[PDB]
Design an enzyme around this catalytic site. Structure first.
Site, PDB file in Angstrom:
ATOM      1  N   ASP A  55       0.773  -1.214   0.000  1.00  0.00           N
ATOM      2  CA  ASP A  55       0.000   0.000   0.000  1.00  0.00           C
ATOM      3  C   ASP A  55       0.809   1.271   0.000  1.00  0.00           C
ATOM      4  O   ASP A  55       1.314   1.701   1.017  1.00  0.00           O
ATOM      5  CB  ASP A  55      -1.037  -0.035   1.169  1.00  0.00           C
ATOM      6  CG  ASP A  55      -1.896   1.207   1.175  1.00  0.00           C
ATOM      7  OD1 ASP A  55      -1.970   1.854   0.088  1.00  0.00           O
ATOM      8  OD2 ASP A  55      -2.541   1.497   2.226  1.00  0.00           O
TER       9      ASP A  55
ATOM     10  N   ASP B  38      -1.566   5.583  -5.329  1.00  0.00           N
ATOM     11  CA  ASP B  38      -2.034   4.721  -4.280  1.00  0.00           C
ATOM     12  C   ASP B  38      -2.342   3.278  -4.682  1.00  0.00           C
ATOM     13  O   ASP B  38      -3.434   2.979  -5.159  1.00  0.00           O
ATOM     14  CB  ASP B  38      -3.321   5.400  -3.695  1.00  0.00           C
ATOM     15  CG  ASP B  38      -3.840   4.690  -2.460  1.00  0.00           C
ATOM     16  OD1 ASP B  38      -3.333   3.603  -2.099  1.00  0.00           O
ATOM     17  OD2 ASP B  38      -4.773   5.268  -1.831  1.00  0.00           O
TER      18      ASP B  38
HETATM   19  C1  LIG Z   1      -3.049   8.072   5.714  1.00  0.00           C
HETATM   20  C2  LIG Z   1      -4.138   7.039   5.784  1.00  0.00           C
HETATM   21  C3  LIG Z   1      -4.703   6.913   7.186  1.00  0.00           C
HETATM   22  C4  LIG Z   1      -5.212   7.323   4.792  1.00  0.00           C
HETATM   23  C5  LIG Z   1      -6.496   7.744   5.147  1.00  0.00           C
HETATM   24  C6  LIG Z   1      -7.446   7.935   4.142  1.00  0.00           C
HETATM   25  C7  LIG Z   1      -7.157   7.731   2.800  1.00  0.00           C
HETATM   26  C8  LIG Z   1      -5.862   7.284   2.474  1.00  0.00           C
HETATM   27  C9  LIG Z   1      -5.491   7.011   1.031  1.00  0.00           C
HETATM   28  N1  LIG Z   1      -5.091   5.628   0.805  1.00  0.00           N
HETATM   29  C10 LIG Z   1      -6.074   4.587   1.041  1.00  0.00           C
HETATM   30  C11 LIG Z   1      -5.447   3.209   1.217  1.00  0.00           C
HETATM   31  O1  LIG Z   1      -4.406   3.316   2.218  1.00  0.00           O
HETATM   32  C12 LIG Z   1      -6.500   2.174   1.681  1.00  0.00           C
HETATM   33  C13 LIG Z   1      -5.850   0.783   1.904  1.00  0.00           C
HETATM   34  O2  LIG Z   1      -6.849  -0.287   1.905  1.00  0.00           O
HETATM   35  C14 LIG Z   1      -6.377  -1.580   1.430  1.00  0.00           C
HETATM   36  C15 LIG Z   1      -7.503  -2.512   0.964  1.00  0.00           C
HETATM   37  C16 LIG Z   1      -7.657  -3.016  -0.244  1.00  0.00           C
HETATM   38  C17 LIG Z   1      -8.865  -3.917  -0.453  1.00  0.00           C
HETATM   39  C18 LIG Z   1      -9.630  -3.478  -1.716  1.00  0.00           C
HETATM   40  C19 LIG Z   1     -10.816  -4.329  -1.973  1.00  0.00           C
HETATM   41  C20 LIG Z   1     -11.945  -4.341  -1.153  1.00  0.00           C
HETATM   42  C21 LIG Z   1     -13.000  -5.162  -1.503  1.00  0.00           C
HETATM   43  C22 LIG Z   1     -12.936  -5.969  -2.657  1.00  0.00           C
HETATM   44  C23 LIG Z   1     -11.808  -5.979  -3.471  1.00  0.00           C
HETATM   45  C24 LIG Z   1     -10.753  -5.145  -3.119  1.00  0.00           C
HETATM   46  N2  LIG Z   1      -9.944  -2.068  -1.469  1.00  0.00           N
HETATM   47  C25 LIG Z   1     -10.035  -1.147  -2.400  1.00  0.00           C
HETATM   48  O3  LIG Z   1      -9.842  -1.364  -3.604  1.00  0.00           O
HETATM   49  C26 LIG Z   1     -10.233   0.275  -1.981  1.00  0.00           C
HETATM   50  C27 LIG Z   1      -9.491   0.741  -0.908  1.00  0.00           C
HETATM   51  C28 LIG Z   1      -9.565   2.072  -0.528  1.00  0.00           C
HETATM   52  C29 LIG Z   1     -10.402   2.948  -1.209  1.00  0.00           C
HETATM   53  C30 LIG Z   1     -11.142   2.459  -2.301  1.00  0.00           C
HETATM   54  N3  LIG Z   1     -11.953   3.431  -2.992  1.00  0.00           N
HETATM   55  C31 LIG Z   1     -12.828   4.206  -2.092  1.00  0.00           C
HETATM   56  S1  LIG Z   1     -12.588   3.056  -4.468  1.00  0.00           S
HETATM   57  C32 LIG Z   1     -14.052   2.176  -4.268  1.00  0.00           C
HETATM   58  O4  LIG Z   1     -11.633   2.383  -5.259  1.00  0.00           O
HETATM   59  O5  LIG Z   1     -12.939   4.291  -5.016  1.00  0.00           O
HETATM   60  C33 LIG Z   1     -11.052   1.117  -2.677  1.00  0.00           C
HETATM   61  C34 LIG Z   1      -8.739   2.548   0.624  1.00  0.00           C
HETATM   62  O6  LIG Z   1      -9.157   3.363   1.430  1.00  0.00           O
HETATM   63  N4  LIG Z   1      -7.535   2.005   0.635  1.00  0.00           N
HETATM   64  C35 LIG Z   1      -4.923   7.094   3.462  1.00  0.00           C
END
Ligand SMILES: CC(C)c1cccc(CNC[C@@H](O)[C@@H]2COC/C=C/C[C@@H](c3ccccc3)NC(=O)c3cc(cc(N(C)S(C)(=O)=O)c3)C(=O)N2)c1
Length: 375
Positions: free
Chosen positions: A34, A218
């Site tokens: 990540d 990201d």
């Molecule tokens: C500094 C920290 C505290 C912070 C705070 C707020 C924003 C950030 C920016 N970076 C985010 C990253 O770090 C995490 C990491 O999550 C890892 C998970 C991956 C699983 C995947 C997934 C979930 C369900 C089914 C298939 C894949 N998730 C996304 O694609 C997945 C994950 C994330 C966001 C999304 N989006 C909202 S999306 C639907 O693609 O538009 C999708 C997400 O939040 N990922 C960083």
């Protein structure tokens, strides 16, 4: 670096992960890579979706830091207890280092049913580590503790697999030129988008809009996420380019799939999207071009498998642009921390079809001297 090639796996937009070991004796865990965060964290208690978890009581090298931590991402949330322990990457560099680890003891909508990973490797900078910037991130400890150069590169493949090369750039992983855009500020891997085209037509907005209020690279987020104003202009343009077929509003919002008879997807009605990134010299840029095979992500489901079904993987954001795995897949991306820059080149694992090919290319000039950074 050959030892490191193909050291990533994934389940298709379920995230790319690398095998690591934590503790002494070594406990094997698969860890999501990540670039969008800066905490190293692992499942450390039972959870219905975890096949395995870190057992601190079995590790003689574990030291508790007597400090909790809570991390909410854009989606998903976990909390746990900080400490340090010995960590290694069996298919990475040949070293073991001591690092901070958040032992996750409660979480919400973070772990995925059948995903295969049990933790997360935040490879971004200390400025965004939780609970604050004094918690040194993994890659900082790695470089300080070993002779590894301060650089890693990702080739995310899917459509899954890939490679994370720690310490260097592997030429066998890409073709053509590497183009570099500067890291604006070391917190996220923040970059600057100077122009967006959809089938060669400029969106024609002030370029600061594309970076409202930052733009990040990201690997932990699936989609290309765009500030509302950019997202609405992008969808207008994609719809107009693809207007021979009309799709429901839910498709555009990522709430419904679109499906075609297997093997008949009309890729040629969908436009190419170009993001131009700020170059390393004033008012020069390069562009990365993505095809609909990147931004229409296949949803695997045996139940709909008479068809190919897709989700629109461009979506709106209120926290700036996120260049997620949509943008990274089929590019070789070099996180050159030492030179405060990120390189892009076409990867050995590009999708293309017989008509169009993803590209990284330049240079492009613009006379308008506006800086595109949003303060
Ligand atoms: C500094 C920290 C505290 C912070 C705070 C707020 C924003 C950030 C920016 N970076 C985010 C990253 O770090 C995490 C990491 O999550 C890892 C998970 C991956 C699983 C995947 C997934 C979930 C369900 C089914 C298939 C894949 N998730 C996304 O694609 C997945 C994950 C994330 C966001 C999304 N989006 C909202 S999306 C639907 O693609 O538009 C999708 C997400 O939040 N990922 C960083």
């Amino acid at each position: 670096f050959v030892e490191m090639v193909d050291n990533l796996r994934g389940k298709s937009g379920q995230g790319y992960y690398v095998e690591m070991t934590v503790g002494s004796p070594p406990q094997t865990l698969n860890i999501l890579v990540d670039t969008g965060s800066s905490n190293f964290a692992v499942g450390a208690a039972p959870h219905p979706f975890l096949h395995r978890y870190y057992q601190r009581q079995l590790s003689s090298t574990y030291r508790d830091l007597r400090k909790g931590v809570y991390v909410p991402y854009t989606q998903g949330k976990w909390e746990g207890e900080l400490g340090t322990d010995l960590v290694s990457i069996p298919h990475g560099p040949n070293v073991t280092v001591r690092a901070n680890i958040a032992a996750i003891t409660e979480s919400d909508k973070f772990f995925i049913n059948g995903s295969n990973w049990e933790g997360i490797l935040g490879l971004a900078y200390a400025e965004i580590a939780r609970p604050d910037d004094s918690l040194e991130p993994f890659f900082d400890s790695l470089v300080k503790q070993t002779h590894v150069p301060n650089l890693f590169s990702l080739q995310l493949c899917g459509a899954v697999g890939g490679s994370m090369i720690i310490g260097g750039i592997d030429h066998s992983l890409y073709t053509g030129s590497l183009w570099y855009t500067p890291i604006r500020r070391e917190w996220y891997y923040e970059v600057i988008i100077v122009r967006v085209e959809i089938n060669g037509q400029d969106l024609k907005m002030d370029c600061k809009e594309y970076n409202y209020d930052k733009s990040i690279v990201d690997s932990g987020t699936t989609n290309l996420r765009l500030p509302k104003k950019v997202f609405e202009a992008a969808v207008k343009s994609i719809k107009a380019a693809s207007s021979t077929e009309k799709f429901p509003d839910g498709f555009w919002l990522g709430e419904q799939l679109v499906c075609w008879q297997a093997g008949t997807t009309p890729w040629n009605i969908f436009p190419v999207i170009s993001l131009y990134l700020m170059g390393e010299v004033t008012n020069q840029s390069f562009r990365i071009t993505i095809l609909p095979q990147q931004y229409l992500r296949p949803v695997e489901d045996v139940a709909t498998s008479q068809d190919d079904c897709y989700k629109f993987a461009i979506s709106q954001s209120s926290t700036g642009t996120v260049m997620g795995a949509v943008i990274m897949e089929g590019f070789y991306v070099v996180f050159d921390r030492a030179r405060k820059r990120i390189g892009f080149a076409v990867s050995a694992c590009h999708v293309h079809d017989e008509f169009r090919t993803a590209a990284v290319e330049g240079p492009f000039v613009t006379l308008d001297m506006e800086d595109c950074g949003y303060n």
